[PDB]
Design a protein around this ligand. Structure first.
Ligand SMILES: Nc1nc2c(ncn2[C@@H]2O[C@H](COP(=O)(O)OP(=O)(O)O)[C@@H](O)[C@H]2O)c(=O)[nH]1
Ligand SMILES: Nc1ncnc2c1ncn2[C@@H]1O[C@H](COP(=O)(O)OP(=O)(O)O)[C@@H](O)[C@H]1O
Ligand SMILES: Nc1ncnc2c1ncn2[C@@H]1O[C@H](COP(=O)(O)OP(=O)(O)O)[C@@H](O)[C@H]1O
Lengths: 322, 340, 332, 238, 318
């Protein structure tokens, strides 16, 4: 079983960092006045966790008879899932507690279906169905009829809560994680719990001895497919200190052997340089402008070697300002 | 007819310049069954189309010159019927998909599929291959892979850079440099001896070759115009005849150099509007204006460097723009500021 | 008889024929020993043997006969876009796995799954890769994916986490030159001294492009008809590479600094038909790796070349851009 | 009703007024007001600004800055705005860039050359010139289709190179020989499948010293009548 | 938990008198309705300004009752196919029903600019065939995408973005029609967030009333999913580039705000920075727009925002 499903909390009391939204939803449900719900925000914040917790709080052992979780981006088709929803709506149960609880995960990826099918689904089944809509990215929600819901924005979880959850997962899975690996995973996921769990499970899979070996930051970076800070720091040091030939050779060798794209190398170098102490602000201005220009040109194509040498020259010229 | 078309070489034996390329084409025509896809790139008016037609004549015979033209109607998506002019022979086809703009891809796909279904093989000559969209080029590569048995493409372009890498790897690169002044002079001498044109000296032909800047079509047409203007008797003092748009652009350059003011800019705008309204491309206008400005002897190095920099900037803006007069006027204003 | 490209003609048949990828080959052998084959992510420099190794692994898994019925080779750079590739993948996955014959079962393991090989995966956008991940998790039971790319960092984290990653080292120049020499000997291609080295240098170590250029040079030599050896000028011509003499003349004209002389030389040069982008690339290669220029000159010229390349990539007039670049370099 | 046509004129006159760009005038008429002026008519305001920004006497010139530098900066900004407009109109869902186009095509260039209108606010000439260019390109396409089997060139090459020689072969003989050149002109036309309509269209493509309107008018009417009668009296290749 | 209707749908303009913006076009439409003559109409304007809503108001004023089949709205880019839409239009136009002498069946074709030459010609022929029975209304983002034959036999109307005064008037009317407690700063914030978008402003007002009741700046910006204008103003007006970068990294980028929202709010704040000289504001707006174009072309990275801040600082400090 996936770790996302396995460690999803079974009760509302186990949700961390969203106390205001938890209290509001609890007040709504405890009185039997559950309205249409819309949960939007960054991924991996606990939307599905909250909905399953409230569903199990309402019904309990017979929650499977009333709830129905469907993915909007399913390859089966929007028409097929619409027919599935219409078939589930016609279902009748002896108990009158609650309503039809349909969960539409990632419903924002409906650039045509939101106005085509979602409007009809929301309108026609008002009498006996409560709808939940989940969104991750910006406002793709077609506000024309989206207003018929209770908006709820999820904020990224605090780092302490993420660390505690990671420790709980480690002690449950009998996994040992280095502190550097934990820091790298937290930085890469940037509050996305789905990414944390998926990377942890995959890294455990790659271990030859899951119960004995320790997951290092190298394993985390290999699993995530992200540039290691050590490689970026080495490239930056070679560019700043060594002459042009050595810097060019080092940059090409590192970003070809390690499979780092030039745009990702630029992003990592910028991230590292943001922490540098520079006496002259003209250095920062030149660095930012030239690197943004190079990245924009890279997006359009162009010559790769020329762009790499342009990055090296831009960094050198900017740091010539001390 | 015109001397440029009457004396066009109709066979590989009638070619006079680029002897090595002629030998290469003869060797290619020696084995018709193994003919690869070809991509001829070089300066304009150097003989690429003539050499392609000569190779086609060497392979199939003189019947390739019995050309007939037709209009093919393609019903694309949304039911927007489009008309494309196709020049066809009993042995080959010639298309210019860039005439359809962004709709070149579907036209290429449909026409190539139809030709493959109709069929040893039929040669398709695509003109202005460098101006094809990237999607059209990908479709062309796909049709090369699918229908290599019955389709042998002969693409002609002025620059190989816009061509994508898969097309380059799937074709044979043929470079066609512009002829030297001596070869152009020899060709013009042959033309004037055939037409019985009096010449005081061959230096007239040398000057025509120099003024044509290696463009053989331009040199031939200039020679015909000079002969017509001089009662079929060219003298050493005979002035070089230039096209109307080139004369207008030179006058505009002299005007820009002489005076730099807002009223001069307005009159330059009027001149540019006149040039653009009569099917003179914006890039051509910009290139001619820049290279006329750079030829002024009164300008110093700094002025010329500023002019070429502004020309590069506004050429990039022309390639990315929609209204050409805007970019041309901006370039002229920048040049006026840099000169003043 | 049909004609086949030399790239696909000389692909290694089995895993033991891969020369300079011993680490990835060993890891793939260990995975093949296991009954379960996870999703794979082959990344490394171009022309190192990623496609060759995945094809060899497939051939060992299914056998020469069943291989063609279990493989869907797709390219992510398809101009038709995300929809066509994803629909093709879905159609391939939906179709039931073909039943292997008795001979295939008894001679080869014939695993129940089917392998989908996707090339240039890093060129996909984030949305395309997310859709690919959704399809992969939908049909994980039947289809195992293998993404081939040059940069693993261009693949989103959710998609990369699902794939075991194999890193291919860049081929040593000796190994690439030996492979090219073996191909030339097998195909009876006459070459002068240093021609294969020039081919590798033009291809920038990419053995795929090197083999393609070698085949093109062989075709050109056959068309020449004299039976003489292939020379460096021919392979430079076929790859669109400006001769070194013209580049040296350009460098000298830039060094002299006279605007009129540079303009005249550029006007003469544009009549020879050489590509301006090749000139810019070779000027970059010459100037950046030259020990006779100080740090400031290279700092300025890198930006100059970058600006010229960016303007050339927009589809502009080559003459104007080249003249501007040369004039700007001459002013340093 | 007819004030819709005057609306772009009023917008251009208000946006080129130098009072609203001073320190005191900026407070009364803020930048939001100027962008709203653009959005009052977003189809004609950039065209009117590009047309009329050279007819002003600037009162907002910086010290040490001449009128020519201001108009050059305005033209640079107008070119950038044209690029932005092309990017906006190429693909939809990019209409969020409309304020940026407003600033780049209407507000900023007016800021650089704001002052007193030297003459009158003239309507944009780009629309008529664009229609004229489209008509002449259609005529050139028809001529190229007619002459494609005899000439080895593209449409642009036909315009730039072949047309002067066609003029020398089809109009100069009339001038230098009266009606005796009708047979030669008809032969040259038949060698390229040129009709009388194509002959009329060809002479309209010439600019500068090569304009042919006055020259054609000066040709005697008897010569033209004989030319058309002889053309209509014989069959021609198709 | 009971039957509810959103304020956007409840207070949508049902008649011509309910429309606040574009007073000249509204006056022309009112004159047309009063005259009792309905000709073919074409409305052109930037998308999202409710062009078809004015046509709906005109149809409501003219037809009155019998609104079931008298008015039909279809999308020119409907996924069902252009041919299907054209056949439906022909069937509806050929279907005649008893109507007053001055009234005719109205067919509205939204996004008609995306149609091709052949489809437009076929629809023009269909409209001319049923001219006396059905009047054709076309809504286009730009009038240049509609062929000249359609333009010649249609009345062209120009629709523009609503001004801030019209949005404020509509919001005040909605507040009066509801039980809304509001303050000046809250309405100013709502108008600031919705740049002439009436529907967005109404949705934001309804959400604020539902969530917090009282309408003030803090509640409005808590409801709105865009960066807070005070934070963006502090980032833009910081005298030190490092402070601007720090604010961008902490309060905007790490808070989950997308780059598009960041550049849009930066444009909005710079446009209204009354304490800065207008030339500096124009330079900053130019830089913000350049980075907005770069983001919309695909490069929605943090480096572009940092470079935008660097250029703005360079302009500010000269
Ligand atoms: N006599 C002679 N004329 C040539 C030769 N090559 C080209 N030309 C002339 O050059 C003119 C234009 O060449 P063209 O086919 O348009 O070449 P392209 O436009 O560069 O592809 C033709 O009309 C020919 O008359 C040659 O080898 N000999
Ligand atoms: N606030 C939270 N408290 C505890 N666990 C959480 C919280 N948010 C997310 N998680 C963990 O993240 C995993 C998946 O998160 P999920 O709710 O699927 O993300 P999304 O919000 O995108 O649906 C769950 O297994 C859950 O244990
Ligand atoms: N390790 C190797 N040993 C021998 N030949 C190789 C090796 N790697 C690549 N090649 C050559 O490269 C060609 C195919 O390259 P390919 O593997 O498609 O490049 P990529 O690694 O980009 O997929 C084959 O013809 C093969 O001969």
């Amino acid at each position: 079983l996936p770790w996302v499903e396995k460690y999803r909390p079974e009760t509302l009391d186990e949700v961390y960092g969203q106390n205001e939204v938890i209290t509001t939803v609890r007040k709504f449900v405890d009185e039997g006045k559950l309205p249409h719900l819309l949960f939007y925000g960054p991924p991996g914040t606990g939307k599905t966790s909250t909905i399953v917790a409230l569903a199990r709080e309402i019904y309990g052992k017979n929650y499977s008879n009333m709830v129905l979780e469907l993915n909007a981006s399913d390859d089966r088709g929007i028409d097929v899932v619409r027919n599935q929803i219409k078939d589930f709506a016609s279902t009748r149960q002896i108990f009158s507690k609650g309503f039809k609880l349909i969960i539409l995960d990632e419903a924002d990826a409906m650039t045509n279906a939101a106005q085509n099918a979602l409007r009809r689904v929301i309108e026609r089944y008002t009498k006996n169905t409560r709808f939940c809509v989940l969104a991750n990215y910006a406002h793709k929600l077609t506000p024309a009829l989206l207003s018929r819901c209770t908006r709820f924005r999820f904020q990224p979880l605090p780092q302490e809560a993420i660390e505690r959850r990671i420790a709980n997962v480690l002690v449950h899975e009998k996994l040992k994680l280095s502190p550097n690996a934990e820091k790298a995973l937290i930085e890469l996921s940037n509050g996305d719990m789905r990414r944390v769990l998926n990377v942890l499970q995959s890294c455990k899979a790659t271990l030859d001895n899951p119960d004995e070996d320790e997951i290092s930051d190298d394993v985390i970076y290999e699993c995530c497919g992200a540039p290691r800070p050590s490689d970026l720091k080495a490239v930056l040091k070679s560019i700043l200190e060594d002459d042009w030939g050595t810097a060019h050779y080092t940059l090409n060798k590192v970003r070809s052997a390690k499979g780092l794209a030039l745009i990702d190398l630029i992003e990592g170098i910028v991230k590292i340089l943001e922490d540098y102490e520079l006496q002259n602000e003209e250095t920062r201005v030149h660095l930012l402008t030239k690197l943004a220009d190079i990245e924009y040109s890279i997006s359009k194509g162009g010559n790769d070697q020329i762009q790499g040498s342009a990055v090296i020259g831009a960094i050198k010229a900017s740091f010539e300002n001390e | 007819s015109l001397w440029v078309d009457k004396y066009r070489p109709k066979s590989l034996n009638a070619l006079s310049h680029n002897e090595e390329l002629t030998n290469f084409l003869k060797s290619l025509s020696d084995q018709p069954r193994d003919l690869p896809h070809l991509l001829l790139y070089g300066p304009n008016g150097t003989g690429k189309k003539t050499r392609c037609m000569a190779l086609l004549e060497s392979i199939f015979g003189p019947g390739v010159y019995r050309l007939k033209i037709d209009v093919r109607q393609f019903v694309t998506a949304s039911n927007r019927k489009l008309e494309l002019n196709v020049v066809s022979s009993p042995y080959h086809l010639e298309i210019t998909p860039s005439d359809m703009g962004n709709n070149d891809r579907i036209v290429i796909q449909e026409l190539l599929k139809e030709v493959a279904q109709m069929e040893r093989y039929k040669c398709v000559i695509i003109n202005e291959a460098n101006s094809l969209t990237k999607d059209a080029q990908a479709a062309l590569r796909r049709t090369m892979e699918k229908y290599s048995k019955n389709i042998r493409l002969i693409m002609v372009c002025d620059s190989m850079s816009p061509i994508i890498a898969p097309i380059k790897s799937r074709c044979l690169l043929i470079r066609c440099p512009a002829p030297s002044d001596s070869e152009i002079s020899t060709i013009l001498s042959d033309v004037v001896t055939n037409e019985r044109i009096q010449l005081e000296t061959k230096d007239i032909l040398k000057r025509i070759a120099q003024a044509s800047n290696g463009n053989l079509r331009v040199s031939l047409l200039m020679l015909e115009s000079m002969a017509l203007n001089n009662e079929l008797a060219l003298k050493s003092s005979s002035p070089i005849i230039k096209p109307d748009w080139i004369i207008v652009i030179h006058k505009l350059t002299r005007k820009i150099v002489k005076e730099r003011s807002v009223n001069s800019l307005i009159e330059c705008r009027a001149v540019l509007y006149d040039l653009l309204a009569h099917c003179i491309p914006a890039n051509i206008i910009l290139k001619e204006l820049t290279f006329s400005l750079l030829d002024v002897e009164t300008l110093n190095t700094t002025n010329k460097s500023s002019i070429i920099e502004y020309s590069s900037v506004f050429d990039e803006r022309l390639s990315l723009g929609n209204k050409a007069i805007f970019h041309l006027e901006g370039f002229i204003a920048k040049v006026m500021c840099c000169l003043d | 008889l049909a004609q086949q490209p030399w790239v696909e003609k000389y692909r290694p048949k089995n895993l033991d024929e891969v020369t300079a990828q011993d680490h990835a080959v060993t890891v793939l052998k260990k995975t093949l020993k296991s009954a379960n084959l996870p999703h794979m992510l082959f990344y490394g420099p171009p022309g190192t043997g990623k496609t060759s190794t995945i094809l060899a692994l497939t051939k060992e898994l299914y056998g020469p006969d069943l291989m063609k019925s279990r493989i869907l080779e797709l390219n992510a750079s398809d101009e038709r876009g995300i929809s066509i590739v994803r629909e093709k993948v879905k159609n391939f996955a939906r179709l039931t796995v073909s039943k292997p014959s008795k001979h295939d079962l008894e001679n080869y393991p014939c695993p129940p799954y089917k392998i989908i090989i996707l090339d240039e995966a890093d060129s996909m956008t984030a949305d395309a890769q997310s859709a690919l991940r959704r399809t992969m998790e939908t049909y994980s039971g039947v289809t195992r994916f293998c993404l081939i790319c040059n940069y693993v960092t261009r693949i989103i984290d959710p998609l990369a986490s699902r794939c075991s990653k194999f890193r291919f080292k860049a081929l040593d120049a000796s190994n690439a030159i030996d492979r090219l020499r073996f191909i030339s000997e097998q195909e009876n291609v006459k070459c002068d001294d240093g021609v294969l080295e020039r081919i590798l240098d033009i291809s920038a170590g990419d053995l795929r492009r090197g083999i393609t250029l070698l085949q093109s040079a062989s075709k050109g030599a056959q068309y020449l008809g004299d039976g003489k050896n292939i020379t460096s000028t021919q392979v430079e011509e076929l790859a669109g590479v400006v001769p070194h003499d013209i580049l040296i003349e350009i460098v000298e004209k830039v060094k002299s600094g006279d605007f009129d002389e540079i303009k005249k030389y550029v006007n003469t040069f544009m009549k020879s038909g050489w590509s301006a982008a090749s000139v810019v690339n070779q000027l970059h290669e010459y100037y950046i790796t030259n020990d006779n220029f100080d740090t400031n000159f290279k700092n300025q010229i890198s930006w100059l070349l970058f600006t010229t390349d960016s303007r050339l990539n927009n589809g502009t007039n080559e003459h104007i851009q080249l003249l501007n670049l040369l004039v700007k370099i001459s002013q340093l | 009703e007819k004030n819709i046509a005057l609306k772009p004129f009023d917008i251009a006159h208000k946006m080129l007024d130098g009072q609203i760009y001073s320190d005191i005038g900026s407070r009364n008429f803020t930048l939001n007001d100027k962008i709203a002026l653009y959005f009052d008519d977003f189809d004609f305001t950039p065209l009117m600004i590009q047309e009329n920004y050279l007819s002003t006497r600037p009162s907002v010139l910086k010290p040490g800055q001449s009128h020519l530098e201001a108009v050059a900066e305005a033209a640079n900004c107008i070119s950038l705005g044209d690029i932005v407009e092309k990017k906006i109109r190429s693909s939809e869902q990019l209409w969020s860039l409309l304020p940026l186009h407003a600033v780049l095509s209407s507000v900023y260039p007016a800021s650089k050359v704001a002052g007193h209108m030297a003459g009158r606010i003239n309507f944009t000439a780009w629309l008529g010139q664009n229609s004229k260019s489209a008509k002449y390109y259609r005529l050139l396409q028809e001529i190229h289709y007619h002459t494609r089997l005899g000439t080895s060139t593209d449409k642009i090459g036909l315009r730039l190179d072949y047309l002067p020689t066609f003029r020398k072969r089809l109009l100069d003989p009339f001038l230098k020989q009266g009606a005796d050149a009708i047979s030669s002109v008809i032969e040259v036309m038949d060698d390229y499948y040129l009709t009388k309509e194509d002959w009329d269209s060809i002479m309209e493509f010439f600019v500068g010293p090569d304009v042919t309107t006055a020259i054609i008018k000066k040709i005697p009417a008897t010569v033209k009548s004989g030319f058309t009668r002889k053309y209509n009296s014989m069959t021609h290749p198709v | 938990l009971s039957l509810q209707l959103p304020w956007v749908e409840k207070y949508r303009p049902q008649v011509l008198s309910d429309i606040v913006g574009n007073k000249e076009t509204i006056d022309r439409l009112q004159q047309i309705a009063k005259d009792g003559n309905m000709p073919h109409m074409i409305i052109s304007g930037m998308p999202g300004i409710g062009k078809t809503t004015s046509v709906h108001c005109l149809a409501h004023e003219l037809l009155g009752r019998s609104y079931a089949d008298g008015v039909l709205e279809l999308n020119a880019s409907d996924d069902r196919g252009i041919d299907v839409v054209r056949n439906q239009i022909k069937h509806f136009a050929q279907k005649k029903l008893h109507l007053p002498p001055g009234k005719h069946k109205i067919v509205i074709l939204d996004e008609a600019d995306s149609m091709t030459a052949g489809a437009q010609q076929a629809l023009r022929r269909t409209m001319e065939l049923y001219s006396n029975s059905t009047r054709f209304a076309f809504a286009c983002n730009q009038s240049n995408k509609i062929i000249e034959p359609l333009q010649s036999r249609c009345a062209i109307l120009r629709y523009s973005k609503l001004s801030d005064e019209d949005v404020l008037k509509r919001l005040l009317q909605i507040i009066k029609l509801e039980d809304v407690k509001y303050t000046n700063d809250g309405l100013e914030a709502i108008i600031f967030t919705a740049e002439g978008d009436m529907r967005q402003a109404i949705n934001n007002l309804q959400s604020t009333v539902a969530g917090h009741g009282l309408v003030n700046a803090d509640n409005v910006f808590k409801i709105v999913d865009s960066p807070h204008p005070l934070i963006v103003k502090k980032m833009l007006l910081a005298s030190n580039l490092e402070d601007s970068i720090q604010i961008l990294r902490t309060d905007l980028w790490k808070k989950g705000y997308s780059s598009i929202d960041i550049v849009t709010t930066s444009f909005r704040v710079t446009k209204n920075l009354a304490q800065v000289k207008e030339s500096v504001r124009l330079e900053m707006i130019k830089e913000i727009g350049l980075t907005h174009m770069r983001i919309l072309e695909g490069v929605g990275t943090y480096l572009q925002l940092a470079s935008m801040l660097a250029k703005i600082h360079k302009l500010n400090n000269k």
